[PDB]
Design a binder for this molecule. Structure first.
Ligand SMILES: COc1ccc(-c2cc3c(cc2F)ncc2ncn(C4CCNCC4)c23)c(Cl)c1
Ligand SMILES: [Ca+2]
Ligand SMILES: [Ca+2]
Ligand SMILES: [Mg+2]
Length: 310
């Protein structure tokens, strides 16, 4: 899982070689190309780094804070330079300028999976098999190589591109940034996290499981759809919704339309007891993942056709 093929090794080396040419990121060295979309507490733009000519994704987080606080956030974000993986979005740098922190990243031309889902309606099982592999490996990388968990897996934090790559972003690195921003949705949080009890990487596995169900059925799955709505397919307030997650049984895929391997996979992800819930090691050898890994699915081609990359 941690071991890479030669295509992934070549691309990661190519990213770093280009990154070494960039140097120190400055506010005036960026030109706006387009707005990509309003995300977690800030607007993300597609931008050109004028000196290097590199296209980037730039998230601007508007905050009014003193030089002490903001300079601590920039040094905390420097660990993202070390997070080098085919399943983690590339980091160029971070800086402060005129009342707003900037985070500059690798541009992913396919966007996030909430955008792809909204375009697709629902995502096919075999496509979600490749999504599952990438999230597991991305989470395995952060945990093994950095002793880090994500803390915020959701469709908007899974980015994709026309080269067929699927990557994670917005994992917890800066404690001070979360303090100063305090925001994001808690609707993908695990029941034990919403109860404020012993939570770990198992909490991200729930979030993946729930995200996969949403992408599979084409709708955030809590509360469950009706028997009539499932036939048509194939309002709770946020506080009422978070109480439902803690108190009611977990969501499941509908039977018949998905394979029992995929149903079992998401079920093992959504067991409410984190001890009983499957771990990354167990999920990596799961029947769904083994089958998915063997399947030669053209994700890039599927993506481009679905979102209209001409
Ligand atoms: C650390 O915090 C982040 C998180 C994500 C990105 C990020 C977003 C992108 C992107 C690349 C990226 F690195 N590429 C294409 C694209 N299209 C739409 N979006 C966003 C629209 C709002 N919803 C979330 C995705 C993005 C950045 Cl820069 C910083
Ligand atoms: Ca300026
Ligand atoms: Ca200036
Ligand atoms: Mg977040």
């Amino acid at each position: 899982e941690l071991e890479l093929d030669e295509q992934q090794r070549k691309r990661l080396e190519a990213f770093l070689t280009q990154k070494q040419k960039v140097g120190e990121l400055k506010d005036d060295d960026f030109e706006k190309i387009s707005e990509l979309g309003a995300g977690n507490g800030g607007v993300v733009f597609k931008v050109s780094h004028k000196p290097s000519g590199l296209v980037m994704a730039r998230k601007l987080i508007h905050l009014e804070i003193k030089p002490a606080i903001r300079n601590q956030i920039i040094r905390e974000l420097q660990v993202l330079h070390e997070c080098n993986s085919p399943y983690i979005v590339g980091f160029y740098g971070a800086f402060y300028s005129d009342g707003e922190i900037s985070i500059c990243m690798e541009h992913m031309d396919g966007g996030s999976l909430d955008q792809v889902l909204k375009k697709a309606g629902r995502i096919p099982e075999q496509i979600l098999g490749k999504v599952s592999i990438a999230v597991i490996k991305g989470l395995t990388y952060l945990r093994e190589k950095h002793k880090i968990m994500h803390r915020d897996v959701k469709p908007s934090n899974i980015l994709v591109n026309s080269r067929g790559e699927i990557k994670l972003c917005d994992f917890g690195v800066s404690g001070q940034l979360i303090d100063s921003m305090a925001v994001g949705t808690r609707s993908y949080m695990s029941p034990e996290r919403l109860q404020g009890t012993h939570y770990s990487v198992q909490s991200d596995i729930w979030s993946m499981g729930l995200s996969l169900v949403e992408m599979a059925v084409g709708r955030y799955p809590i509360p469950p759809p009706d028997a009539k709505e499932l036939e048509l397919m194939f309002p709770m307030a946020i506080f009422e919704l978070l109480d439902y997650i803690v108190n009611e049984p977990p969501p499941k895929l509908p039977s018949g339309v998905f394979s029992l391997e995929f149903q079992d996979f998401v079920n093992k992800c959504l067991i409410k007891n984190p001890a009983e819930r499957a771990d990354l090691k167990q999920l990596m050898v799961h029947a769904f993942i083994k089958r998915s890994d063997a399947e030669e699915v053209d994700f890039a081609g599927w993506l481009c056709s679905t979102i209209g990359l001409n």
